Ligand binder design. Structure first.
Ligand SMILES: *[C@@H]1O[C@H](CO)[C@@H](O[C@@H]2O[C@H](CO)[C@@H](O)[C@H](O)[C@H]2NC(C)=O)[C@H](O)[C@H]1NC(C)=O
Ligand SMILES: *[C@@H]1O[C@H](CO)[C@@H](O[C@@H]2O[C@H](CO)[C@@H](O)[C@H](O)[C@H]2NC(C)=O)[C@H](O)[C@H]1NC(C)=O
Ligand SMILES: *[C@@H]1O[C@H](CO)[C@@H](O[C@@H]2O[C@H](CO)[C@@H](O)[C@H](O)[C@H]2NC(C)=O)[C@H](O)[C@H]1NC(C)=O
Ligand SMILES: *[C@@H]1O[C@H](CO)[C@@H](O[C@@H]2O[C@H](CO)[C@@H](O)[C@H](O)[C@H]2NC(C)=O)[C@H](O)[C@H]1NC(C)=O
Lengths: 464, 455
């Protein structure tokens, strides 16, 4: 111990200091390199405060006695299939109008009076309470004369600024996360009435939206109905034209995404009617891939995840068809509910139309790109429509849509995408409309050749 | 009484393992209900292992911990290999695994939702290791007061997850548990590796020396303080994983990088302010658990001639294990710079669990041949022949699985068998190894200014 003491002295102590001097230089070097790597590393953008309806699809439910079953229709029964609705990974239920509406009369139609035929507020409170735990927020339609020739009253329902206003306060007290009105062409100068109600709803809380609707396909009418307010998710007949032409389904989408550019929109074929009222059968798979990938929020009626066809199954009312839950869910003249059509006859098939909807909704409601990734669409073959959904550092995407009759090649002449999102030569396939292509095999975009009426969906995370 | 002993031990088992392992377990389990039973099984197996070690230490009474528990039950030959394997595999990898998570959770506040570059994490990890070792080497008192404060911050690091994880159970947020025992395939080929994560969380009872001279009323409060304090820890970890599972679904738990940060940002509003600072303070307390824990092993081993005489000396003043850290430091750098946490943990747990299942298997030998020698505590012969035959079956099966990170561990352990030529050899070639041994001894104890303990 003492021999060590004498040995810590001139000549070999000079070494001792230098050792921890080099050690401290090395440690400060490690720390400085760390902070430089912190500085050099790209700082990502901020998440733009997504609401609940910004995350997943909505789900309109028009006729309860047709969504539930003849005679069995009531508000309580919605608890039975609320797990089915949460299986689709939806985030809303446009449910209604379930208020008291005798007929065609303004003084005999109250919004604040729940319709007894669906069940009173005893079932409604339970509806909300059991909807909250599955994160399936409820939205109620207030179209007052929803049982007459015209959706809005005839002479003048001026009391909408009174009655609907009291509704937008009372029911927001109850806990309904948004509302909706339909055929806002009849609502005389709706742009100010919608202004009042949107002011009420957003000012009440920003986690409370307001959807509208109209039967117009002219963008000028839609823009003039989006006159001042731009947080209103107007669902219109803009796409109601069957279209599918190489430019209509291209030009309409671009031009509407060119009016406000990025402002959040709502994507739906119609305000109330099903997909199949307009779409031929072979495009039912096709459009569901488009609507889930376009920027905005998709809106689906009941049975648009399985394609309720009024042509295959007769007897169905044209406005409100009957949902098929099982092998006897049709109570009228039976014999046409063969397992192909039903829900359970499609929950098992991996290639079923319901399964496609489930995969698409899972991807849409989960991965950060589809929620809020920017949108760029580039030129391609005459019957195509390709685009990309890219965010800051999250996964990319790519979708190809053949709207023609003859199998075409991709013809990807992109040549203008930002260098942050420029296409690679092989992209990881994820799914397809018409199955058969191996889902997971990176496909080549120079030899990318389509089949008629086929979609695609690919992935490429190059520091994306 | 046993009250303080329960606190003493429970301050060791709890740690960063509850933040590092969950995703690892779920990875190679494929389910949620099948993952929450792995945690329970590893909890009961840790109970069995600690309860066996308590008997090993109570029937030998040669103080020194794990090393002495193998020195004479088998012979010096496995004992030297135990020290070799620990100081070449276990302690470096364990430190680098705790600190690879500390470095992540200390950079999480700055990279709020970004992809932290893999090298920044390693650089911050190495800086943290260097800070911890300078703290342990410059002074001791401030390495114990800080350890107490960090134990408190370690308890808080899990009470800050359990409480928000049960406040939503009382609400009724049970949705991820519906198909509990169902998920991916995850065959038996990936069950041992999940076992490794499961038993890594319940770490600390290894280096937990027990004394019959000080502990009040022995044969009473040594097992009655491990039975009723590993059950508490098992319950705590089960509830913590349940809290993780109620919020985070299995899939986004799998794709995540740190679990506590996701749980915080999905529950709390002040998430970055508290959670990836208390988890970091708990990981810092865990890596601070290298405080003399390894140096006592040097002191015990070097006495009967296994480690060099250098490695068991203390500073002239500022008395610290200075030579015991400049040997654990470069190895830790090599591990954390040339390895991955999913591949360092296999490397760690193969060599740990092999030489623990070969240790507790000694009990089944000491009870049969040479029996009835000062046996105050007496476990029934159901726990050793259920812990030995589980370590030596989740390890022997961990070579059919992942042989490129456990195969190297097995090679290094086997290298200990030749490495017994350092201990015994016909001649050390005075000029060619003895001269360098003496010169390095001189230089190493003259540079560090360290002296023998009291010899
Ligand atoms: C409510 O709607 C009106 C239009 O109907 C929005 O426009 C403002 O209306 C108030 C009403 O007194 C005027 O004083 C303002 O000058 C109008 N313009 C602006 C820019 O405020 C109004 O923004 C909407 N939101 C509210 C009032 O919160
Ligand atoms: C929306 O549907 C109506 C239903 O016929 C279309 O026709 C309008 O009907 C209302 C009331 O029946 C009349 O007041 C309008 O003059 C009708 N318009 C036309 C052009 O005939 C209406 O055209 C549809 N909306 C659009 C934009 O075409
Ligand atoms: C549609 O979007 C494009 C680019 O996103 C823009 O089109 C410009 O239109 C004006 C007038 O028609 C031309 O002078 C420019 O040369 C066009 N730009 C390009 C790049 O071609 C514009 O943002 C939108 N179009 C309009 C008419 O506003
Ligand atoms: C479910 O799919 C099968 C397979 O296509 C359908 O069988 C077709 O039925 C149509 C009648 O609309 C025939 O024209 C086709 O020739 C049939 N296809 C084959 C391959 O035979 C079946 O009809 C579908 N289910 C229902 C209820 O229509």
């Amino acid at each position: 111990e003492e021999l060590l003491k004498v040995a810590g002295s001139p000549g070999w102590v000079r070494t001792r200091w230098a050792l921890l001097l080099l050690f401290w230089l090395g440690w400060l070097g490690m720390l400085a390199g760390a902070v430089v790597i912190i500085v050099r590393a790209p700082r990502c953008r901020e998440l733009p405060a997504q609401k609940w309806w910004h995350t997943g699809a909505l789900y309109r439910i028009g006729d309860l006695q047709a969504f539930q079953g003849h005679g069995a229709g009531n508000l309580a029964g919605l608890k039975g299939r609320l797990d089915y609705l949460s299986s689709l990974k939806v985030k809303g239920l446009v449910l209604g109008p379930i208020h008291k509406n005798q007929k065609d009369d303004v003084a005999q139609t109250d919004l604040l009076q729940i319709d007894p035929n669906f069940g009173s507020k005893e079932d409604f409170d339970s509806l909300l309470q059991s909807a909250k735990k599955k994160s399936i927020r409820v939205i109620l339609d207030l179209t007052p004369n929803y049982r007459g020739e015209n959706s809005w009253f005839s002479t003048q329902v001026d009391t909408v600024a009174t009655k609907v206003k009291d509704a937008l306060e009372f029911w927001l007290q109850a806990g309904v996360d948004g509302f909706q009105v339909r055929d806002i062409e009849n609502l005389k100068d709706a742009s100010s009435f919608l202004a009042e109600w949107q002011n009420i709803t957003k000012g009440f809380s920003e986690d409370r939206l307001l959807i509208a609707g109209t039967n117009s396909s002219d963008l000028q009418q839609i823009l003039s109905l989006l006159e001042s307010n731009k947080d209103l998710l107007l669902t219109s007949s803009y796409l109601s034209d069957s279209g599918s032409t190489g430019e209509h389904t291209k030009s309409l989408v671009t031009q509407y995404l060119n009016a406000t550019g990025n402002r959040w929109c709502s994507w739906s074929l119609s305000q109330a009617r099903l997909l199949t009222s307009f779409l031929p059968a072979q495009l039912l798979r096709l459009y569901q891939l488009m609507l889930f990938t376009l920027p905005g929020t998709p809106v689906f009626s009941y049975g648009d995840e399985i394609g309720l066809d009024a042509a295959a199954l007769p007897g169905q009312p044209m406005e409100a068809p009957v949902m098929l839950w099982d092998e006897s869910s049709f109570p009228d003249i039976p014999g046409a509910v063969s397992a192909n059509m039903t829900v359970k006859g499609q929950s098992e098939d991996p290639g079923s139309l319901l399964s496609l909807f489930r995969r698409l909704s899972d991807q849409r409601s989960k991965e950060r790109s589809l929620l809020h990734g920017d949108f760029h669409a580039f030129s391609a073959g005459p019957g195509l429509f390709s685009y990309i959904r890219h965010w800051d550092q999250n996964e990319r995407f790519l979708v190809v849509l053949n709207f023609g009759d003859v199998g075409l090649s991709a013809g990807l002449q992109a040549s203008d995408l930002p260098a942050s999102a420029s296409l690679p030569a092989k992209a990881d396939l994820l799914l397809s409309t018409q199955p058969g292509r191996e889902e997971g095999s990176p496909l080549e975009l120079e030899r990318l050749k389509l089949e008629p009426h086929e979609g695609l969906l690919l992935r490429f995370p190059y520091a994306a | 009484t046993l009250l303080r002993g329960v606190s003493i031990i429970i301050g060791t088992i709890i740690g960063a393992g509850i933040f590092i392992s969950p995703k690892g377990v779920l990875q190679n389990t494929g389910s949620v209900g099948m993952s929450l039973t792995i945690w329970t099984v590893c909890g009961v197996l840790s109970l069995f292992g600690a309860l066996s070690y308590a008997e090993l230490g109570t029937t030998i009474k040669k103080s020194g911990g794990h090393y002495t528990y193998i020195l004479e039950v088998f012979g010096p030959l496995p004992a030297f290999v135990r020290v070799w394997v620990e100081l070449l595999i276990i302690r470096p990898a364990a430190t680098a695994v705790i600190s690879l998570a500390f470095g992540r959770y200390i950079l999480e506040p700055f990279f709020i939702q970004c992809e932290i570059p893999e090298l920044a994490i390693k650089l911050i990890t190495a800086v943290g290791i260097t800070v911890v070792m300078v703290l342990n080497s410059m002074s001791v008192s401030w390495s114990a007061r800080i350890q107490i404060f960090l134990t408190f911050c370690k308890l808080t690091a899990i009470l800050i997850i359990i409480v928000p994880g049960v406040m939503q159970l009382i609400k009724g947020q049970t949705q991820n548990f519906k198909d509990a025992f169902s998920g991916r395939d995850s065959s038996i080929t990936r069950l041992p590796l999940a076992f490794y994560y499961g038993m890594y969380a319940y770490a600390g009872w290894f280096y937990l020396n027990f004394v019959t001279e000080e502990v009040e009323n022995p044969e009473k409060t040594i097992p009655l303080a491990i039975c009723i304090s590993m059950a508490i820890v098992t319950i705590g970890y089960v509830l913590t994983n349940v809290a993780y599972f109620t919020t985070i679904n299995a899939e986004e738990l799998l794709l995540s990088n740190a679990v506590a940060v996701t749980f915080s940002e999905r529950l709390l509003g002040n998430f970055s302010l508290a959670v990836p600072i208390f988890v970091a303070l708990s990981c810092f307390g865990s890596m601070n658990g290298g405080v003399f824990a390894v140096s006592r092993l040097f002191y015990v081993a070097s006495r009967e001639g296994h480690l060099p005489e250098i490695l068991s000396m203390i500073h002239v003043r500022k008395h610290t294990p200075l030579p015991a850290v400049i040997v654990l430091h470069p190895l830790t750098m090599i591990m954390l710079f040339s390895g991955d946490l999913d591949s360092l943990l296999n490397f760690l747990s193969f060599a740990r669990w092999l030489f623990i299942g070969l240790a507790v298997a000694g009990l089944i030998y000491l009870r049969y041949k040479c029996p009835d020698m000062h046996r105050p505590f007496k476990v029934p012969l159901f726990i050793p022949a259920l812990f030995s035959f589980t370590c030596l079956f989740m390890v022997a099966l961990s070579l059919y699985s992942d042989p490129f990170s456990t195969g190297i561990g097995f090679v290094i352990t086997l290298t200990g068998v030749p490495a017994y030529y350092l201990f015994i050899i016909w001649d050390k070639k005075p000029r060619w190894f003895r001269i360098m041994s003496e010169k390095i001894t001189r230089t190493l104890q003259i540079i560090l200014e360290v002296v023998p303990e009291e010899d």
